[PDB]
Amino acid sequence: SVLTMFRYAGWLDRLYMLVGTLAAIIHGVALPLMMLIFGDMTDSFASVGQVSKQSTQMSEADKRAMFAKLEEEMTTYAYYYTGIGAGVLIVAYIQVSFWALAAGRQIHKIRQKFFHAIMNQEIGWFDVHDVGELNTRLTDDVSKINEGIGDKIGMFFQAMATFFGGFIIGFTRGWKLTLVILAISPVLGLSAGIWAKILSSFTDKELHAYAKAGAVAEEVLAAIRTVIAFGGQKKELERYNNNLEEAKRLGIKKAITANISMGAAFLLIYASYALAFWYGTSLVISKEYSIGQVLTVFFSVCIGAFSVGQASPNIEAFANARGAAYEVFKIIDNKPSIDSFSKSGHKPDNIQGNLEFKNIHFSYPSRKEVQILKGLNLKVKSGQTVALVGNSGGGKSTTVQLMQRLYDPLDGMVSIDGQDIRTINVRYLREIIGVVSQEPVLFATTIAENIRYGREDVTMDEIEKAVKEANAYDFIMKLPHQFDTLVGERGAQLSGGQKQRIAIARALVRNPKILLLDEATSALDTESEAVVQAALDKAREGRTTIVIAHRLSTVRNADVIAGFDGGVIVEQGNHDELMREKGIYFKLVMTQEDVPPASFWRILKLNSTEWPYFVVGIFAAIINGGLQPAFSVIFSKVVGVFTNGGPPETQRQNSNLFSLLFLILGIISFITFFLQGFTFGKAGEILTKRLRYMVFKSMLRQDVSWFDDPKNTTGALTTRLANDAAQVKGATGSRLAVIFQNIANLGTGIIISLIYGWQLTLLLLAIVPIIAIAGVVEMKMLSGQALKDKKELEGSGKIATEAIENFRTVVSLTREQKFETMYAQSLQIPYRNAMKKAHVFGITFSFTQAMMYFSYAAAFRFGAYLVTQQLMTFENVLLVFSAIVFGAMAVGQVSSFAPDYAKATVSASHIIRIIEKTPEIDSYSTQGLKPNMLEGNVQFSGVVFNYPTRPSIPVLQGLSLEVKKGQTLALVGSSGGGKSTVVQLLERFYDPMAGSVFLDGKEIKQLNVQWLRAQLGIVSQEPILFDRSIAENIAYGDNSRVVSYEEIVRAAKEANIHQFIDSLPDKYNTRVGDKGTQLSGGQKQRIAIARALVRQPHILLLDEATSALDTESEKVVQEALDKAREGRTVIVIAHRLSTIQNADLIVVIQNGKVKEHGTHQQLLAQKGIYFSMVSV
């Protein structure tokens, strides 16, 4: 389970990682070979050169000779170092490039496999789980795995190789002593293991919190219109904030525990240093060990221990990857019972559909206590039409879902031609099914592509034939871009009837043997319904149909009608047989970018409130970062005091003071490392929480037209927020802390060299530009593709989210493979850029390391000229060189910061742009008139409006209408005529191009936006709920006020939904599904009606609030509204005749214009359009 990742390596990734590990081992061993010349060899000649120099030895004749000898040996070692520089160049690329190449390939396969696993789950699995977390897992956790399985493992292996090189060199030069030094290595190993395990657990919890935050964001952004209409921005921001607070506290805990562990680790390592130094002093005083021997072993083990210490961020990244892999591979390992990707099962050649439901018992997985079907029995013969009639929630849509095997029955059997559908192949079974759902859902693509999801290889002639049969041909040809016009998310940029007709055509192109039509004409007008019904009846002979309808005209011509009661069929037979049996059908019928370079810095300004955390951390960065180079200087005293120590007692005292100093340095290192990690980590967590909060608030501030933009889809927005926050976080925190430490390491070197040797400091002037340019050029590349990589990423996150939100449609259309192919295609450009980065970062790291070895060689050469010319002491040369190597050991980590900084800068620029964005219709604005009283007069005067996504099409052409308090306005007309546009404009979702809208004679642009929307109670054409309880969904109707239980129950009673909630276990605490899919269509609509009514609004806007209701439920809701007619102004959009005649005034809208206005009797008196609609 620990090594559950690397599952998809394969032979190529296994060889990329074997060869890279060998290259890392060679690169690591290159550094103890550097130390091999110290202590002895070069330093054997040195403590021989001046400490053991003769006071005078014909120095005028032979000191020049040993200086030349040391000139000659230094030149040889300079050649050796140039060779090592070339070798390190080669091995450093292979290490870094191959490791990132393998990480990139594995991450590509992991993303594909995780998406495939999500697409393989059952409908019940989606019902039980909160799938809004899945896109956050796709974007955040996979990137967390990527940073722990890549070149960081190569760096860890290089550090381990350097440590082992010091290990062998110490034992070769002198054992028993390096045993004392390295006997504490198991303690550090256990400490690192515990550290990593705690980091992994904290990462798992933090990713859970971030996934919950992403689920909240996805739910809110998907239903943004409902949030805006009901003024829910503050509360949704608050739920998002609660998840962010959980993530922030987890991150702070992680930082504290990790840093206290690391500080204890360094306290232990310096205590070990002190004990080892005492032991070495004892040995060297005993004369068992020469001073050079202890020098060599100490220095060799010291560099290896320093490499191990610098390896810690790699272990942290590996632990974070392990913490991230948990949920991803848990989902990947899940196996569904109803497998749609299985190749098993029967595929009959010729099917003459004989549908049978025998003794069907079903309870939904998420509400298993509730029985929906109790021994349901139904038979459908080939070529026959069955009409399922009954009250809302009876289980008709449940039967439709069971027919396509979205769930298995608890008891009983669903059979085709006497064969159990469990034994049939799932994909084959669902491919011969054409289905139109109760509330059709489209995809964010073109009309032609939406229809092509029904059948992939359908030609344009068959698409035209289907849209002619679906009565969608005319409006498609009328609008520009023809079939290539792109519909909104879920088809939101079409009218309800247009979307329904598109879904009908999508079902028709399948050429299905079995057609399920769950209220396929709910959003249609009378003429469209009639023509679509004629088209369907034209081809009823070769196919079996199960139709659900609340319109009696469609049920009239059905071959057989089945009535639902108590979960069973009570009446089945012919229309005349049903009239004669006087059943339930009897009662039913009599009820007739710029990317500014300073952007990242600006983001850091947003963290300025945490300035005291930074300064302390900066100090903690200056001290310990300056300690590693200064470790040389004091160590120069360590030998220097000992060599001139003289008597054994004086040397013993000096060495025990040195050991005490080492212990003090360990205490200081514990303190400073804990502070440097903790302060920067806490500042980073605070910054990330603040940035996420601000970005979500800005997104909730934006206009409706902004969400209508094709770039601003729900998946794109969620991916944008998560990715920008993560990329900015990548450059802040402990990462920035270690960068500051490394900068201190590199910085103290200049000063200490300047005191000790100034000429050699000129090399830093020659060494730093050459590295620096190598840094900036990569800056230009990794930035340029990052702007692309994010954009493409926003595409991929779109495809996944559209697939996860619309999963039931995808499964019904058998389009899991198509969406997987699109998701794989959207990953191509990022995957190629990941392969390009491997070589680019491999080359850069390789060049930087060579340059260090090349500078080392130059220093040794430069050093000799100085010594052969008596310009500097050799001891000073060695001290300066040790300073340079200790300072430069962190240059690799500094260069590794380049990929993070560019991504952070780009994401910072995007975050700054989104926060500063100001909408045209600002919902957060406190400006605007708030009238003391509201009379309820609504007027439209010459309103002309074009939707921003399709500005060439005029939707409203001088629309004018009036409605007063106590009056009911009934907007009727054909589909797509602009009825919902009026309600959207009254909510100030958009502003009209011309004309005006008045509320009590005051133009609504002058009014406060929130105040204006608070006077409105809206029921949208296709209502959307939240993944919350019924009580919370109703109480959403009046935010900024705590709605009591009594008011919620009263609203539910007014909406005729109270009885269903009360009978339901958990009652008002029953969690509804995502967007209300775990309810009946009529139940969800009634919940929406209760949500609008609990507000008690002055203007009630009902956009077909009774489309999915029963006749009895419609009657109850209508009488409830009638009892509260006076005292409010009501605007009603309805295709039902019975809801229109009681309205005070009726407006017929065609082509954005009023054609007929007046009462029911007046419109019936003249033989106009209204009479035509009535007669049909």
Ligand SMILES: CC(C)CCC[C@@H](C)[C@H]1CC[C@H]2[C@@H]3CC=C4C[C@@H](OC(=O)CCC(=O)O)CC[C@]4(C)[C@H]3CC[C@]12C
């Ligand atoms: C020690 C250094 C100097 C030599 C390089 C190590 C080689 C032993 C390895 C590591 C890189 C490998 C190559 C990396 C790239 C490819 C492409 C790769 O192409 C595919 O995988 C194609 C797609 C498919 O096969 O379906 C085939 C192996 C090959 C030639 C590899 C062959 C074996 C190589 C040369």
Ligand SMILES: CC(C)CCC[C@@H](C)[C@H]1CC[C@H]2[C@@H]3CC=C4C[C@@H](OC(=O)CCC(=O)O)CC[C@]4(C)[C@H]3CC[C@]12C
């Ligand atoms: C011997 C010294 C001079 C070092 C230089 C070696 C290169 C000249 C060779 C050895 C390593 C090879 C590379 C090893 C791996 C890759 C990545 C490989 O792409 C992948 O990662 C495969 C999967 C994918 O591309 O999707 C394409 C070939 C390439 C660049 C190989 C091209 C030839 C390279 C660079």
Ligand SMILES: CC(C)CCC[C@@H](C)[C@H]1CC[C@H]2[C@@H]3CC=C4C[C@@H](OC(=O)CCC(=O)O)CC[C@]4(C)[C@H]3CC[C@]12C
């Ligand atoms: C502390 C951090 C920075 C470094 C950790 C290094 C090791 C813990 C990693 C690095 C490379 C990994 C290996 C890379 C590839 C494979 C092959 C792969 O083998 C399988 O078991 C495959 C299973 C399958 O294919 O179904 C996964 C395990 C293994 C040995 C991995 C085991 C864990 C290893 C040794």
Ligand SMILES: CC(C)CCC[C@@H](C)[C@H]1CC[C@H]2[C@@H]3CC=C4C[C@@H](OC(=O)CCC(=O)O)CC[C@]4(C)[C@H]3CC[C@]12C
């Ligand atoms: C884009 C550029 C800057 C990158 C390529 C840099 C190389 C061309 C440089 C980097 C370090 C240089 C080396 C630094 C030091 C030495 C040692 C030097 O040794 C002697 O002259 C000593 C001879 C003696 O006294 O016995 C010879 C040149 C050499 C190999 C240099 C050769 C040229 C090197 C490899």
Ligand SMILES: CC(C)CCC[C@@H](C)[C@H]1CC[C@H]2[C@@H]3CC=C4C[C@@H](OC(=O)CCC(=O)O)CC[C@]4(C)[C@H]3CC[C@]12C
């Ligand atoms: C860090 C690298 C990658 C870029 C910069 C390289 C320089 C720092 C190197 C390359 C050429 C080197 C020089 C090449 C030759 C000489 C002459 C050399 O003279 C001798 O020792 C020769 C015998 C004699 O003294 O007569 C003294 C060092 C010096 C100045 C070297 C000093 C270091 C230099 C300037």
Ligand SMILES: Nc1ncnc2c1ncn2[C@@H]1O[C@H](COP(=O)(O)OP(=O)(O)OP(=O)(O)O)[C@@H](O)[C@H]1O
């Ligand atoms: N996914 C689900 N999880 C739990 N219960 C569900 C789910 N879908 C529907 N139900 C419940 O199952 C019952 C049957 O509802 P169903 O959707 O079958 O109604 P319908 O008869 O087709 O009615 P209408 O046409 O009014 O929507 C209701 O109590 C409903 O809330």
Ligand SMILES: Nc1ncnc2c1ncn2[C@@H]1O[C@H](COP(=O)(O)OP(=O)(O)OP(=O)(O)O)[C@@H](O)[C@H]1O
């Ligand atoms: N967000 C949008 N972007 C672009 N065009 C839109 C958008 N919403 C609706 N339209 C288009 O505006 C026109 C009127 O749509 P509207 O929803 O107002 O019609 P309607 O009369 O309510 O229709 P129906 O009875 O079918 O629900 C149609 O052509 C529709 O496709």
Ligand SMILES: [Mg+2]
């Ligand atoms: Mg239904």
Ligand SMILES: [Mg+2]
């Ligand atoms: Mg509409």
